[PDB]
């Protein structure tokens, strides 16, 4: 019978009481009846749930750092989170399970990371895919009145794993189907609630089951999680990869994996760093590294077919010069510094989600009747930034050498060259003010200076967002001097030493410093 | 009886433990009861699903290219992809199987290309149409609580085909529904995940099922796919067909199968290159070949009824002059070059998904009060491009010999005479500038010159997209010399040889190079 299993499973109190009550209710029924299948199946579910079986969580931080650095590169803040968990777990047992949300663009290593933690903490990996899930019964099940009643994929995966310390990876929280017919994202408000998981009532089990030590790591692409559910999760925003990070990921983790998936032998293929960097500069324009391993896999695969169909060569070196012969023609390109100091042209810094880029900001000031025209598919905040720049110039028209009646005598065209790409933002206002102080004075803007900042009518420079990708975009070009806002100095502690050592980074307070540095002849 | 089926169709560990635990649960049930039917349904659904059966993937690359060239013409990049798959598969016993997204205009043969691939690789063929599909339970199914439940249609097709190495053809992956009520595109985000196909957990068969060797090939018409799905697929762009390869598809593939579909013998109907190229030039206006084979099929059935109703003429010969006797009035007309050098008009190069076309751009500069009107169903980037071009002419008007107060004294009207067709993009911008200079000087633009490129206020020419159909449109139109930007020289590496041989192609860097080449007199 079952009482050696119910006694053998050292349950908590109320689960043992309901389980034994269903046992002595089971031993008074006909065994070939349907009620014996309901109660018998209920006990057969109650015995499989891991009521107290645990997995021994690791304690060495150096070896766990070596596992996290073994499987992935560079994701420093999540590895810090796991080491802090293993430290506080190393001091006491039965901690609350950490509830995390990984938020980033596709390919930054959110789903593949959730197995590495399950090897670094010594937990057991388990994964639920929540993309497009609309049924709430995948989380809370049905009651056992119905015919085939099962306790939902949480209790099914706890019963399949067999311990009460797993690592649930919840893929695509932000892709759950929210509707009046189906909303399982609010059924998770009991599942991951940091002070209510100790009594998670299931609709099939009917007994409170402890989920407090289950480690919940969830992955999402955005912040469109409902705010009752987004508040319960410690959110780590995995930003996009840089070029040195994509280089080291591509040469420490992607080349051995794609050599192994294509069975490349030792002296058979050699892809150096210049070809990898040419893939990064010239063929891929993403934030992740999945199209990067597409191009690496295409290099290895074309090497396999060329060696199999040539039979005379036995070594292919792809050195970035013959990369064109394999991947095809160069798809994309990045922006570079100009080589000559020009009058109505400054170098702006822009940021998008795949990285940073340089902006050209061109002004033409023709003798006219005061018409102001702004082209380049500009947003409304950028147009307001040009109007603020013109107000700064018209307020300071005397001490800049500008004829103060140019608002009636000069037509001004402000154009940003890639007119097919939409652009919006408060930044590059000191850039547009610099390009308007020039071409009203004939002062050329020096070509090795990029700048970013938001301007006020008093002449101040306000902070901006994302200095790291902008300083990498300026370092990738021929920019040598970067004018940043003053209160963005607090970002300069998270910049690599190459960018700090190469760029001459000036923080500025007011527009007179910007015009003092970024003009060939002093404005004042 | 059932446990010999479980041990016969040998499973992995978790499927065997779940299925034998399910049968041991079935052993204490009455046979005619509802829970017994749910358990038996889960058991025979676990028995129909293949766990270990595969297919011998081919190894000969020459015969595989013979099959791929037997079914389709051209399409060298996808055929390269399939032969490279067969090379790596020839070296390795089991690899992950490619996830491909074929993207192109309709009629370019990406649905039939899948069955060509499944024939050329030895893999079994499975098709699933995703056009307009809104329910996410077509992919994952429902729990076995529900009455009449079953797995997703993917698991049903895997259980139908019997092997774990099929070719899935995901038809219309971009025409899937995506709203709050239905989102199967995020349900495909697990099954197209290149790392997590080893554990595909659907809702009926709640065991993990391995899909890390199924070849997924998806077909779509546009890049209107969610960015997580686009990142999980390998995009192959199938561009439109040229005149020579439509001639070769028609001669090598369309004419023999439309002869085969109409019982036309070898000595009844003959169609030469003049009729085929006349259909391509004057009846189709497409990117695919589907209206082309509709015109060919129309010729064949008219030939059939002309062989039945007459029965004294027994050989019909269709060529370039008697197509209107069968097909009728020419539906379309390609753009042609102009014959005289005319003040104010230029010929930009336009490109749509149907193909490249010539783009006449004209300007009138009448004496007035500086009015600026721009007609011709222009976009907003196009009108900003004309404003930038006019600023380049205006800041350079002393060098060009132009009276610099023309912004006060003369009214300028830029028009593109197609009218009803909407037109957008900066690629006409250089052309705009040239037209304005002509219409301010009386110096006519020579009609044998086309041009393309983006303009900046400095005067520089920036790169543009899609040179191949623009140069094919200039070669079709009778242009003898084009003007491309400088940094598009690389795209000249993938142009056919007759187009390079006929066109005098000049890359330009700035605007006075264009005004030096494209105008009749020196500026």
């Amino acid at each position: 019978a079952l009482k050696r299993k119910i006694e053998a499973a050292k349950m908590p109190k109320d689960a043992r009481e309901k389980t034994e009550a269903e046992l002595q209710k089971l031993k008074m029924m006909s065994p070939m009846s349907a009620e014996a299948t309901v109660v018998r199946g209920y006990i057969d579910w109650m015995l499989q749930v891991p009521w107290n079986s645990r997995s021994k969580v690791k304690k060495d931080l150096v070896k766990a750092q070596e596992v996290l650095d073994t499987d992935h590169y560079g994701l420093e803040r999540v590895k810090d989170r796991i080491l802090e968990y293993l430290a506080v777990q190393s001091r006491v047992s039965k901690i609350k399970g950490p509830i995390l949300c990984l938020v980033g663009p596709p390919g930054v290593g959110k789903t593949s990371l959730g197995q590495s933690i399950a090897k670094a903490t010594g937990r057991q990996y388990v994964r639920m895919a929540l993309g497009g899930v609309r049924d709430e019964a995948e989380i809370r099940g049905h009651r056992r009145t119905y015919i085939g009643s099962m306790p939902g994929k949480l209790i099914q995966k706890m019963a399949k794993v067999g311990v009460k310390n797993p690592l649930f990876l919840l893929d695509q929280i932000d892709k759950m189907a929210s509707d009046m017919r189906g909303d399982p994202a609010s059924a998770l408000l009991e599942v991951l609630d940091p002070e209510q998981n100790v009594a998670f009532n299931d609709h099939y089990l009917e007994v409170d089951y402890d989920l407090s030590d289950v480690m919940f790591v969830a992955t999402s692409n955005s912040m469109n999680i409902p705010a009752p559910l987004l508040d319960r999760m410690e959110v780590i925003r995995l930003s996009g990869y840089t070029e040195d990070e994509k280089l080291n990921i591509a040469k420490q983790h992607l080349l051995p994996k794609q050599f192994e998936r294509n069975a490349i032998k030792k002296g058979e293929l050699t892809i150096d760093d210049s070809a990898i960097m040419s893939i990064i500069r010239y063929y891929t324009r993403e934030a992740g590294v999945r199209s990067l391993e597409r191009e690496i896999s295409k290099l290895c695969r074309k090497a396999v077919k060329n060696l199999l169909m040539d039979k005379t060569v036995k070594h292919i070196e792809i050195n970035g010069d013959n990369l064109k012969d394999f991947l095809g023609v160069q798809k994309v390109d990045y922006g570079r510094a100009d080589t000559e100091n020009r009058v109505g042209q400054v170098t702006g810094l822009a940021w998008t989600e795949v990285g940073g880029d340089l902006l050209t900001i061109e002004t033409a000031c023709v003798p006219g009747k005061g018409k102001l025209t702004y082209t380049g598919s500009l947003g409304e905040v950028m147009q307001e930034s040009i109007q603020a720049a013109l107000t700064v110039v018209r307020a300071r028209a005397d001490k800049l050498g500008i004829n103060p009646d140019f608002y009636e005598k000069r037509d001004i065209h402000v154009h940003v060259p890639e007119g097919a790409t939409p652009k919006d933002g408060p930044s590059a206002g000191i850039a547009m003010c610099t390009a308007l102080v020039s071409c009203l004075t004939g002062n050329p803007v020096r070509a090795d200076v990029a700048m970013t900042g938001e301007i006020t009518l008093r002449g101040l420079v306000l902070p901006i967002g994302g200095l790291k990708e902008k300083l990498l975009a300026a370092h990738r070009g021929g920019i040598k001097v970067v004018l940043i806002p003053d209160d963005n100095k607090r970002d300069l502690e998270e910049i690599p030493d190459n960018v700090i050592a190469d760029l001459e980074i000036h923080p500025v307070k007011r527009i007179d410093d910007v015009l003092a540095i970024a003009l060939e002849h002093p404005a004042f | 009886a059932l446990k010999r089926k479980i041990e016969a169709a040998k499973m992995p560990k978790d499927a065997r433990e779940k299925t034998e635990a399910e049968l041991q649960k079935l052993k204490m049930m009455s046979p005619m009861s509802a829970e017994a039917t749910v358990v038996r349904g889960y058991i025979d659904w676990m028995l129909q699903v293949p766990w270990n059966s595969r297919s011998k993937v081919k190894k000969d690359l020459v015969k595989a290219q013979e099959v791929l060239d037997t079914d389709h013409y051209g399409l060298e990049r996808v055929k390269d992809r399939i032969l490279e798959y067969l090379a790596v598969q020839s070296r390795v016993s089991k690899i992950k199987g490619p996830i491909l997204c074929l993207v192109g205009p309709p009629g370019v043969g990406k649905t039939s290309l899948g069955q060509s691939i499944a024939k050329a690789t030895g893999r079994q063929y499975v098709r699933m149409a995703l056009g307009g599909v809104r329910d996410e339970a077509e992919i994952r199914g429902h729990r076995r609580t529900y009455i009449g439940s079953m797995p997703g249609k993917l698991i049903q097709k895997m259980a139908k085909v019997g092997v774990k190495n099929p070719l899935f053809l995901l038809d219309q992956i971009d025409k899937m529904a995506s709203d709050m009520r239905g989102d199967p595109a995020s349900a495909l985000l697990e099954v197209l995940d290149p790392e997590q196909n080893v554990a595909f957990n659907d809702h009926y068969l709640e065991v993990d099922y391995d899909l890390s060797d199924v070849m997924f090939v998806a077909t779509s018409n546009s890049m209107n796919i969610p960015a997580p799905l686009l990142d999980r697929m390998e995009v192959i762009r199938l561009s439109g067909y040229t005149e020579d390869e439509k001639l070769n598809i028609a001669k090598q593939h369309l004419l023999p199968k439309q002869f085969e579909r109409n019982a036309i013998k070898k000595g009844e109907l003959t169609i030469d290159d003049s009729a085929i190229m006349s259909i391509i030039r004057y009846y189709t206006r497409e990117a695919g070949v589907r209206s082309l084979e509709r015109e060919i099929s129309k010729l064949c059935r008219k030939a059939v009824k002309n062989l039945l109703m007459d029965k004294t003429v027994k050989h019909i010969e269709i060529n370039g002059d008697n197509l209107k006797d069968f097909l009728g009035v020419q539906k379309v007309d390609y753009g042609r070059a102009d014959t005289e050098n005319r003040v104010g008009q230029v010929t930009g190069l336009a490109w749509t998904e149907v193909g490249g076309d010539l783009l006449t751009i004209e300007t009138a500069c009448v004496p007035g009060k500086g009015k600026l009107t721009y007609t011709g169903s222009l976009g907003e980037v196009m009108q900003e491009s004309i404003q930038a071009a006019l600023t380049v002419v205006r800041a350079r008007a002393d060098k060009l010999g132009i009276n610099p107060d023309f912004y006060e004294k003369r009214d300028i009207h830029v028009h593109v005479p197609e009218g009803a067709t909407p037109k957008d993009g900066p690629s006409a911008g250089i052309a705009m500038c040239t037209a304005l200079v002509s219409c301010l000087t009386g110096n006519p633009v020579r009609a044998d010159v086309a041009m393309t490129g983006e303009i900046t206020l400095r005067g520089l020419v920036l790169p543009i997209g899609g040179l191949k159909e623009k140069l094919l449109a200039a070669h079709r139109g009778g242009i003898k010399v084009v003007l491309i930007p400088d940094d598009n020289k690389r795209d000249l590496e993938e142009i056919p040889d007759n187009v390079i041989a006929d066109l005098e192609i000049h890359p330009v860097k700035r605007i006075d190079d264009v005004l030096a080449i494209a105008l009749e007199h020196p500026a």
Partner: peptide, 7 residues
């Protein structure tokens, strides 16, 4: 008599 949940 036994209840059964339909979708």
């Amino acid at each position: 008599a036994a209840a059964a949940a339909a979708a």
